[PDB]
Every structure is written in C-alpha cells, then in structure tokens.
Design a protein around this ligand. Structure first.
Ligand SMILES: [Ca+2]
Ligand SMILES: [Ca+2]
Ligand SMILES: [Ca+2]
Ligand SMILES: [Ca+2]
Lengths: 405, 7
C-alpha cells in the first residue's frame, strides 16, 4: 500500500503553486489515468508547505474525487476551490526529453563502436528506460547513424543478453507477435508458450497483437493457430485469441453468476465425460470479475474447486490451457510468479520463459509479481534471478525486476 | 502531445 497523505494549503494570489499532468485521455504513464504532480512552483503555497513533491498522485481535492477524471476535469476542480484547499495525495514507492533520447542514442552508439563492445552501458540505459522511451531511442539512433538500432545490437551482442535486449526493443504487440510466431514454428507448437501468451493477454492487448501479427507476417494470427493446433485445444486457443471477452460491466449479474456455476458443474464433475464447448464458451466470453465470482459460486455446487475439476475432467494440452487460464483469471501476478519460479527452480534455466516474462511484464505488473513471489517462496524474485543467471545478462534481468524485496 | 497545467 502506497502512503496516502493529507496536505492542506491556502490558495494564494497565484494559485496553489504546482502543475499537474495525467488524466483520462492524457495519461502521464501508459495505462494510468491518474493525476500527477509534475512541477512545484518556487515561492508558491505548495513549495512553502514542503510536503507535496513531483511524482505525487492526486486522489482528491475538497469535495472532488480526482480518480479517473479527465485532465480538464482535474484542472477545473483545482482552480475552483475555496481558499482552504485539502488535498489527498498518494506517495510513490518520467521527465524524458528529446535531449535524453538523443543523448541515449549517442551513448549507445559509442558503446557499440567501442572495442569489445561496452555491454554494461548498453544494459544500463536500455533496461532503465520504458518501452516508449526505447522507441524514441531507436528512432533517434536511426536518424543519427542511418542504421537500425536493433540490427546494430544484434551484431554487437550475443547469447541470452542479445535475446533480452532485442526483445526490449520491440513494442509490446510486436514482441508478443514474434513470440507467438516462434511458438508455432514447425509441426504443431510450443504449447506452453502459446498458452502463456494467449491465456494472459487482455482484449486490448490481443486486438493490437492481431493487427501487428498480420502486418509483420502477412497472415492472420487465428489462421496460424488453426494450422498448428487441433481438437478442443485449438477451439479454446482460437476463442481466446479473438480478444472479444465481455468487458468489465459496472453491474454484477448475480443470476448469471449462479447459472454459469451450475452449467460448469453440470458440464463436468456432475456427469460422465465433459461438455467441453460449454466450458469454453463460459470461460472465454464472461468478464474476468464475473468469472472470479463464478469460480467461487461453483464451489457451492461442486465437491472440487475449478482447478481440481479441470485436472479430473480433461487431460493433455486442453487441461494445461484451462489450468493456465483459470490462474490468469484468479490471480495473474501469482500466475507469472509461479512460471518464473518454475523457469529457475531446477537444473539450468528455462531462459525462454524467464526472458519473455521479464521483458513483457516489467511495465505491466512486476511489482505485484514480486510481491506474490516473495510471499509464496520466501525469497525475492531478485534473489532467484541472481542465483540462476550471471554477468550482464543477470544485470539486465535484475534491472527489469526493478529491485530486491 | 500531453497536457500539463499550472494550478
Ligand atoms: Ca563487453
Ligand atoms: Ca549475433
Ligand atoms: Ca466426469
Ligand atoms: Ca536453476
């Protein structure tokens, strides 16, 4: 829990003395609509009070809640207050200019051209920038050298470190599209990786993957899935990859929650065999909060919970996919914490899984993954990465982890 | 372009 703080100010002749960014339709951080303090005006009320800081998140001012408001709504609320201003703020636990992007591109070029390659500098920069900032770096690099940064780094780097850095240079949709393409390489597929991506990505993420996949490979993702999978496993993967799950409605449909729970029990544990199309329809079409409540209501009817019912009712790839999907519905950060543990726990390392999760979740929910990991396994994700990887490859992964717990 | 506003 981030620290929530109360700050009271007197509105001065020149206002409150700070600047805000963020808001619905004006995100200061990708995927985050919150209002953020971005400047403290010297001599103003905020500065003389001393508590408010850059990076603080505004939760409310007087009678106005500032969560999920547009930028203009926040401005109007903050400019039309009483003289007595009571701010509710949340403390954290970037001001990235073109100068920063150009300097990064220039320093990366120097690191590439250095004899023996200065991998340390390359890692220090790229693993400590957001995906959008890396995109800015890649465009600045191309403008300066007339060469693609990814191609230059492919030649300068090797091993698992090259895999990390080149994956970070792709947009989220490009990275997932190329990982899905790689998973379907050859007869059939790496079902584990296909399952991991298709079961964990949201509607919005899948919609962008579907578009970028077609642009990169000149074929639909759905057609490639169909060509390399079969049976009920194919049906489940195809249904999920469409990214047409019901969106989180504000109204909870309790009658449907009960009927879905009965239908899941009637389709499996209650009867000989399993009505797999019924399971597919319910678990791919209902919203995630709805299904969380369905899986709890299911326990009212069934002698086993949903995960145990899946193990007893189906087998093979279909069982694996359903088990991964239900974990993603119930607790996705815990799901990735478990896959990370499994990638490192035994002899060697499943670097393909370790790299993909660290690259793809570093900007999504890495803090929640780290929290679930430490709570379950007693040691930090940082520690397990330290014990299973070495050198600059380790340093890159540790930066994507973001810290020790 | 993103908006930043002084208050
Ligand atoms: Ca080196
Ligand atoms: Ca190479
Ligand atoms: Ca049965
Ligand atoms: Ca190991």
């Amino acid at each position: 829990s981030e620290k929530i703080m109360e700050i009271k100010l007197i509105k001065g002749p020149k206002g409150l003395g700070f600047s805000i960014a963020g808001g619905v339709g004006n995100q200061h951080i990708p995927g985050d609509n919150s209002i953020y303090v971005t400047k403290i005006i010297e001599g103003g009320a905020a500065h003389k009070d001393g508590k408010l800081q850059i990076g603080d998140k505004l939760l409310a001012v007087n009678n106005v809640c500032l969560e999920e408001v547009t930028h203009e709504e926040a401005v109007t609320a903050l400019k039309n207050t009483s003289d007595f201003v009571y701010l509710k703020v949340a403390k954290p636990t970037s001001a990235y200019t073109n100068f920063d992007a150009e300097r990064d591109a220039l320093n990366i070029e120097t690191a590439i051209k250095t004899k023996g390659v200065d991998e340390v500098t390359i890692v220090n920069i790229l693993t400590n920038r957001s995906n959008e900032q890396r995109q800015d770096i890649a465009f600045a690099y191309q403008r300066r050298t007339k060469k693609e940064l990814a191609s230059a780094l492919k030649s300068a780097l090797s091993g698992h470190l090259e895999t990390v850095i080149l994956g970070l240079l792709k947009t989220p949709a490009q990275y997932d599209a190329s990982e899905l393409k790689a998973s379907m390489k050859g007869l059939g597929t790496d079902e584990d990786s296909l399952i991991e991506i298709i079961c964990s990505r949201t509607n919005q993420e899948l919609q962008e993957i579907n578009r970028v996949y077609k642009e990169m490979y000149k074929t639909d993702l759905e057609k490639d899935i169909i060509s390399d999978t079969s049976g009920d496993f194919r049906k489940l993967m195809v249904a999920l990859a469409k990214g047409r799950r019901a969106e989180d409605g504000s109204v909870i449909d309790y009658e449907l929650i009960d009927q879905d729970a009965r239908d899941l029990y009637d389709a499996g544990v209650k009867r000989k065999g399993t009505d797999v199309p019924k399971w597919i329809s319910i678990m791919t079409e209902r919203s995630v909060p709805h299904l969380q409540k369905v899986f709890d209501r299911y326990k009212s009817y069934s002698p086993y919970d949903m995960l145990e019912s899946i193990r007893k009712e189906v087998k093979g790839d279909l069982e694996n996919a359903f088990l991964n999907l239900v974990q993603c519905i119930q607790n996705k950060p815990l799901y990735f914490a478990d896959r990370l543990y499994d990638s490192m726990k035994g002899k060697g390392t499943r670097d393909k899984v370790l790299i993909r999760i660290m690259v793809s979740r570093s900007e999504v929910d890495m803090l929640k993954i780290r929290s679930e990991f430490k709570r379950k396994y007693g040691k930090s994700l940082y520690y397990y990465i330290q014990q299973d990887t070495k050198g600059d490859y380790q340093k890159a992964l540790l930066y994507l982890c973001g810290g020790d717990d | 372009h993103f908006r930043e506003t002084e208050v």
